[PDB]
Amino acid sequence: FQPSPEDHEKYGGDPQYPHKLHIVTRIKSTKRRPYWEKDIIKMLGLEKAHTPQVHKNIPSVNAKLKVVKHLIRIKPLKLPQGLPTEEDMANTCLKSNGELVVRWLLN
Amino acid sequence: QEERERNNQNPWTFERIATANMLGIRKVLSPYDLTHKGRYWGKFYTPERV
Amino acid sequence: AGSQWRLQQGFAANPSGYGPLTELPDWSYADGRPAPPMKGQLRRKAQRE
Amino acid sequence: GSKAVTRHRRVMHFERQKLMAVTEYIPPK
Amino acid sequence: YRSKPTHGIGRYKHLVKAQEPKKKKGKVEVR
Amino acid sequence: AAMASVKLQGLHKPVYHQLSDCGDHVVIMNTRHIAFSGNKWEQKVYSSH
Amino acid sequence: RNRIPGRQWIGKHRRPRPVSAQAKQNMIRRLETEAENQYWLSRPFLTAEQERGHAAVRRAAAFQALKAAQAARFPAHRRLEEQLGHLLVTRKWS
RNA sequence: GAUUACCCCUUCUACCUUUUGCAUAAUGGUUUAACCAGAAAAAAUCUAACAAAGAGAACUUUAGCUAGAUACCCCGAAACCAG
RNA sequence: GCCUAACGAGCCUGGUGAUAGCUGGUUGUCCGAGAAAGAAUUUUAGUUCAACCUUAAAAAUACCCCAAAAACCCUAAAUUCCAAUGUAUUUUUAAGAGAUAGUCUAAAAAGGUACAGCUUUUUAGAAACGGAUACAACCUUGACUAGAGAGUAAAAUCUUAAUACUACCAUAGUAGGCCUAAAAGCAGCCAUCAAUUGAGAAAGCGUUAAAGCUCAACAAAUUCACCAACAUAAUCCCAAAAACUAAU
RNA sequence: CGAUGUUGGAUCAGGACACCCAAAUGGUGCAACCGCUAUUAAAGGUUCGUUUGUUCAACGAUUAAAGUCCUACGUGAUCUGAG
Ligand SMILES: [K+]
Ligand SMILES: [K+]
Ligand SMILES: [K+]
Ligand SMILES: [K+]
Ligand SMILES: [K+]
Ligand SMILES: [K+]
Ligand SMILES: [K+]
Ligand SMILES: [K+]
Ligand SMILES: [Mg+2]
Ligand SMILES: [Mg+2]
Ligand SMILES: [Mg+2]
Ligand SMILES: [Mg+2]
Ligand SMILES: [Mg+2]
Ligand SMILES: [Mg+2]
Ligand SMILES: [Mg+2]
Ligand SMILES: [Mg+2]
Ligand SMILES: [Mg+2]
Ligand SMILES: [Mg+2]
Ligand SMILES: [Mg+2]
Ligand SMILES: [Mg+2]
Ligand SMILES: [Mg+2]
Ligand SMILES: [Mg+2]
Ligand SMILES: [Mg+2]
Ligand SMILES: [Mg+2]
Ligand SMILES: [Mg+2]
Ligand SMILES: [Mg+2]
Ligand SMILES: [Mg+2]
Ligand SMILES: [Mg+2]
Ligand SMILES: [Mg+2]
Ligand SMILES: [Mg+2]
Ligand SMILES: [Mg+2]
Ligand SMILES: [Mg+2]
Ligand SMILES: [Mg+2]
Ligand SMILES: [Mg+2]
Ligand SMILES: [Mg+2]
Ligand SMILES: [Mg+2]
Ligand SMILES: [Mg+2]
Ligand SMILES: [Mg+2]
Ligand SMILES: [Mg+2]
Ligand SMILES: [Mg+2]
Ligand SMILES: [Mg+2]
Ligand SMILES: [Mg+2]
Ligand SMILES: [Mg+2]
Ligand SMILES: [Mg+2]
Ligand SMILES: [Mg+2]
Ligand SMILES: [Mg+2]
């Protein structure tokens, strides 16, 4: 888990500041896999495939993701307009590229 | 056998996939395949595999 | 198909995903008063919130 | 099932065959 | 334990000689 | 045969359907001068009992 | 004319089914995705020490709510309307 | 599944029993009508009466006693004994 | 043997609804959860416990789990134990039956022929109405109903089928010593010097021994030249066919 | 195992080629004759008797040759029952 200097430019990461939140999407199936991988999927909220779920970037969560890193797709969460306020909670929409748009389809 | 292993243009190698447990391949591979690096299968040794 | 192209442009992989073809109301009264909201649209706006 | 070491080039699991075919050596061109 | 860094801290058999016991049938001054 | 098979079935008509009797005649001339690719003139064999 | 002895997918002698060009591409596509998976996990935002008990009140509250909901299990109230509503079976038009 | 159209087209390895596994070339049935196979309340749970007491005698009682409701198949041997 | 068409011991009635761990059968709809074997047993064709599971109830902690920690000669994959964190699970009490005849794939071993669709254990997986043409075990898959909507996953013809090496030219000491019936470059032993610009007391063939042919060295002259070859089965071969109009 | 009838012959034979004969050919320690060995070819053919239930084997006579093997070691809802 040591990134090469060229990895940051390839994946669009930030060399200095790591991202803050995860977006985890399950791809493969828990079937035909050992039982300990099934429990980790269940306890991460990834029961239903192709449904994005947001998790922290703390080492405690990353410890579980490394076990099932071959069954999920992980993308950073980008905030073009910043964190939503209490006024714009109902207008939030999550795009495919991995950014959260606070104001979606105004007027 | 070292020059052919240094100039290899294939990004993925048996050593990289097996050790990192990519694609959950450890369920198919044997624990001895970590050291053999895929060059040994049973008693048969294939020198052309990198 | 062509889901890879749609992902590149920023749209959803499936044309039914948060597109303008789905969010907008499909029918309205002739006089102009708004139609009651869809059951699906209300549910979709609840999980986003 | 057969032993770990045999005399007849033990046939690999199909998933392993794909692994042996994707990790080939490509000489520089 | 094997994986612990303090493995083999109790090793002593390599400090003293083997000291082969004088067996009843093998008792001989093998010089 | 590839293009002749399509015409016989009617797979070129947008009104195609297996139940319907859509079908077109095909006339092939100069069949003595066909050119088998490779050494298939001596290797391919047609067998019947 | 040529048969595969026994079952064709188990045993010492199997079917010679080879790996196709499509199968090779499927492996690579999954490998590229997993290569990206292990990069975003490389650099955490917080270290191991800085996350020591950062969110424990919420965890404690969540467990307390679970105990509260599970401790409310009790038979529901019984009212006179339920028993006296059975007499409406023989309601008539006089 | 359909279709203007019965077929023509496309898609589907009968049913029970018995087994690790049955379209199996393992078992049984030509088909129809009639007849033919889950039964017991000691401890328990649910509802109710009355309660340090309950029960229309005889008993049980450190919240118990009385009452109700909830339960456990059919066909078949070679044999054995007496008259 | 025969004793009323069946006698290793008649027939009939009664005991009799004899008794079977053994075989067969077990009748309306719909819904919820759902188990492959550890221990004794005239016991392994069965039962009774434990584990697991169902229904009801009470309670608080269960899984994941970092550092620390678990043997002395050498010793892999990795387990045990535990805070955080992620997540709702787990324990206890009261009632219970079924199951206790297992198959393959990958991995660590044992018996065998480093044989079996073989057998005995441990860890893990599965038992699609999709894919591998057919297919219990391999791969894709969180199994609701309706629609003449849409995006995707596993996945469809696999490689090579390979090896030409051809000019020109040979004379000295000398049958070198030894050896042997005879050993003249050419059984063996020993030495391996030396004429000629050029040629080994000899690389191969040959002779009883010689003779003779050929290869190294002259000159002439100059594409390249390590290696890579492997028979057949019994009813009738087995989709048909295709080397380029743009493919993450 | 609520049955897949079991050796040999008789009848009829289907097939493979790792060919016994018949046809073509290479090599030889092939002069010729008689042989040994290898390649190619499966349309046809591959005998009659004594003893044994015999397949097998021994022996007599002959033939261009009396091939090897599969087919539920073919074939008993066609026969034979010696074993
Ligand atoms: K097999
Ligand atoms: K049967
Ligand atoms: K049976
Ligand atoms: K039956
Ligand atoms: K028994
Ligand atoms: K000599
Ligand atoms: K039988
Ligand atoms: K013949
Ligand atoms: Mg095995
Ligand atoms: Mg088979
Ligand atoms: Mg295979
Ligand atoms: Mg089947
Ligand atoms: Mg069986
Ligand atoms: Mg069973
Ligand atoms: Mg049947
Ligand atoms: Mg049976
Ligand atoms: Mg019948
Ligand atoms: Mg009672
Ligand atoms: Mg008695
Ligand atoms: Mg009697
Ligand atoms: Mg009688
Ligand atoms: Mg009975
Ligand atoms: Mg058992
Ligand atoms: Mg039990
Ligand atoms: Mg630790
Ligand atoms: Mg804990
Ligand atoms: Mg049992
Ligand atoms: Mg088993
Ligand atoms: Mg087995
Ligand atoms: Mg067995
Ligand atoms: Mg298991
Ligand atoms: Mg299929
Ligand atoms: Mg679903
Ligand atoms: Mg020369
Ligand atoms: Mg041959
Ligand atoms: Mg065909
Ligand atoms: Mg039958
Ligand atoms: Mg015969
Ligand atoms: Mg014949
Ligand atoms: Mg031949
Ligand atoms: Mg001949
Ligand atoms: Mg027979
Ligand atoms: Mg017979
Ligand atoms: Mg007869
Ligand atoms: Mg017959
Ligand atoms: Mg007889």
Is G25 within 8 Å of chain B by CB? Answer: no
The resolution, in Å, is 3.6
DSSP code at position B27: G
Q: Using CA atoms, how far apart are residues F12 and F6, in angstroms rounded to an integer?
A: 7
> Are B23 and G28 an interchain contact pair (Cβ–Cβ within 8 Å)?
no
| C-beta pairs of A27-34 under 8 Å, 24+ apart in sequence | A27/A71, A27/A72, A27/A73, A27/G33, A28/A70, A28/A71, A29/A71, A30/A71, A33/A71, A33/B24, A33/B27, A34/B27
Q: Using CA atoms, how far apart are residues A71 and F5, in angstroms rounded to an integer?
A: 45
How would you write chain A as a 3-class SS string? Answer: CCCCHHHHHHHCCCCCCCCCEEEEEECCCCCCCCHHHHHHHHHCCCCCCCCCEEEECCHHHHHHHHHCCCCEEEEECECCCCCCCCCCHHHCEECCCCEEECCCCCC
Beta strands (DSSP E) in chain B are 40-41, 44-45
How would you write A12-32 as a 3-class SS string? Answer: CCCCCCCCCEEEEEECCCCCC
Amino acid at C34: P
Alpha helices in F1-49 (DSSP H): 2-9, 40-43
Q: Gap from E23 CA to H37 C1', in Å?
A: 82
Amino acid at A49: A
List the single residue in D with minimal CA-CA distance to B15: D23
> What value, to the nearest 5°, has the Cα angle with vertex D9 and ends D7 and D13?
130
Among G22, G21, D23, D17, CA closest to B10: D23
- The length of chain D is 29
Q: Could you tell me the CA-to-CA distances from G66 to A39, A41, A47, C34, G60 in Å, in that order?
A: 20, 22, 21, 43, 10
The two three-digit tokens of residue C37, written as one number: 């909201």
Q: Using CA atoms, how far apart are residues E18 and C20, in angstroms rounded to an integer?
A: 87
The two three-digit tokens of residue G81, written as one number: 């309307």
DSSP code at position F4: H
> Are D18 and G17 an interchain contact pair (Cβ–Cβ within 8 Å)?
no
Phi then psi for A22, rounded to 5 degrees? -95, 155
Q: Using CA atoms, how far apart are residues G4 and G13, in angstroms rounded to an integer?
A: 8
Evaluate whether D21 touches B5 at the Cβ level (below 8 Å).
no
Is D19 within 8 Å of chain G by CB? Answer: yes
Q: Using CA atoms, how far apart are residues A34 and A41, in angstroms rounded to an integer?
A: 11
Count other C-beta atoms under 10 Å from residue G66's C-beta: 10
Phi then psi for F3, rounded to 5 degrees? -75, -30
Alpha helices in chain C (DSSP H): 3-9, 20-23, 39-48
Give the method used.
cryo-EM
Amino acid at B26: R
SS3 B3: helix
Among A71, A76, A73, CA closest to A99: A76
Q: Could you tell me the CA-to-CA distances from A99 to A96, D27, E21, G62 in Å, in that order?
A: 7, 41, 79, 30
Report if CB G58 to strand I is under 7 Å. Answer: yes
Q: Could you tell me the CA-to-CA distances from E15 to C48, D22, E6, E10, E11 in Å, in that order?
A: 72, 53, 18, 11, 8
Q: With contacts defined as CB-CB under 8 Å, which chain A residues touch B23?
A: 70
Which H or E element spans position B5?
Answer: helix B3-6
Q: Using CA atoms, how far apart are residues B19 and B35, in angstroms rounded to an integer?
A: 9
Alpha helices in G3-89 (DSSP H): 21-40, 57-71, 80-84
